[PDB]
Amino acid sequence: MSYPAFDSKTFLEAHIEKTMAFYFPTCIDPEGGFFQFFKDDGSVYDPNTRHLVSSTRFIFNFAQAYLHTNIAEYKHAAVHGIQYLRQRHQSQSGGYVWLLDGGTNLDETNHCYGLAFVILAYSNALQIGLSEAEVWIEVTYDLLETHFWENKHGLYLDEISSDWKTVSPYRGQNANMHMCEALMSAFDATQNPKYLDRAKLLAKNICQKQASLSNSNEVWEHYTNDWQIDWPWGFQPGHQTEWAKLLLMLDKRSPENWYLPKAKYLFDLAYKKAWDTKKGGLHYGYAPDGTVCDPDKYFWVQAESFAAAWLLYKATKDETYYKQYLTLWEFSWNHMIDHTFGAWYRILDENNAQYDNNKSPAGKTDYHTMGACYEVLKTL
């Protein structure tokens, strides 16, 4: 054995701990919230600009770490995060500031994607004991119901302007994926079956209905306001495998006989199309053609895929998925993970070369990789 035991509790916990150590305590802004732009070495390289997605995802980080390690200062960092979320990001209209610099808002557009992560963050707040979050979740859900929920399609639209008056013609799978995920987190935290029912409806609508609109029956990213397919461009493997994971997670909460075959199908297809057989890892995107059309290697794709693989292996006992889990971890250990400073590199080229030394710009808190580890951990 020349690799770590990627399927061991010890390894997964060790890796999470080293990733946590890259961000803590550097990301803490004594002024409020978190710094969101980190160099490979840990340096903050932009202390002012903040994005709702990192503001919420860091809440996920510290909350999950507290739930697993029971280290008190992690609960403190999560609460610090919640405070920043509610006092700085949560504006007037109930909507959340998308992007901001100091006391100035840069972008006040309402993104459904953002709202999903706001719900995710409130779930985590609740599970670490902020009793009030149950209400916050409940509030945010209705903001979405009122403004984003599109009952005749069973999906959420993507964005509305800050005034709440101009709706974007754009429809996208992404907001619905993360929305589904968030609502599962909400169901676990609250047991309110409303949320689980919405998660399963989103799952059905994206993975069955919207998927059927494609040749390969894979989930396409971009849709018209009809929710017809609008021809980044191409299929995104990471979202196929991410969906596989979500389906299996739903299949353990509220079973459905198409979940496992669909997860199985999406993963097999995505992995086979996107795995770089010479240098390793999954490419970022391929055409409906199946031609790889963006060969860069992203962290979240590797991570969501090894979570999906692990779940698939537990579900089927097919040793294929175990082996693929090991391949994804091997590639990751050898190329994505900074063994000096901790946490994952964001992106490599074709040849597994870094593009630069920006470990985590806004958006990346290593929510994806720690989350993937956490869910494999539940199965152990």
Swiss-Prot record:
The alpha7-alpha8 and alpha11-alpha12 loops of the catalytic domain may participate in the formation of an open substrate-binding site to provide sufficient space to bind 4-OH D-mannose derivatives. It comes from Marinomonas mediterranea (strain ATCC 700492 / JCM 21426 / NBRC 103028 / MMB-1). The active site is at 239 (proton donor/acceptor), 368 (proton donor/acceptor). It is an enzyme of class 5 (isomerase). Belongs to the N-acylglucosamine 2-epimerase family. Monomer. It catalyses: D-mannose = D-fructose; D-lyxose = D-xylulose. Keywords: Isomerase. Optimum temperature is 30 degrees Celsius with D-mannose as substrate. Catalyzes the reversible isomerization of D-mannose to D-fructose. Can also isomerize D-lyxose, with lower efficiency. In longer reaction with a higher concentration of enzyme, it can isomerize 4-OH D-mannose derivatives (D-talose and 4-O-monosaccharyl-D-mannose). Cannot use D-glucose. Its EC number is 5.3.1.7. The keyword Isomerase applies. GO terms for biological process: carbohydrate metabolic process. Optimum pH is 7.3 with D-mannose as substrate. It holds the Pfam family GlcNAc_2-epim. InterPro entries: 6-hairpin_glycosidase_sf, 6hp_glycosidase-like_sf, AGE/CE, AGE_dom. GO terms for molecular function: isomerase activity. This is D-mannose isomerase.
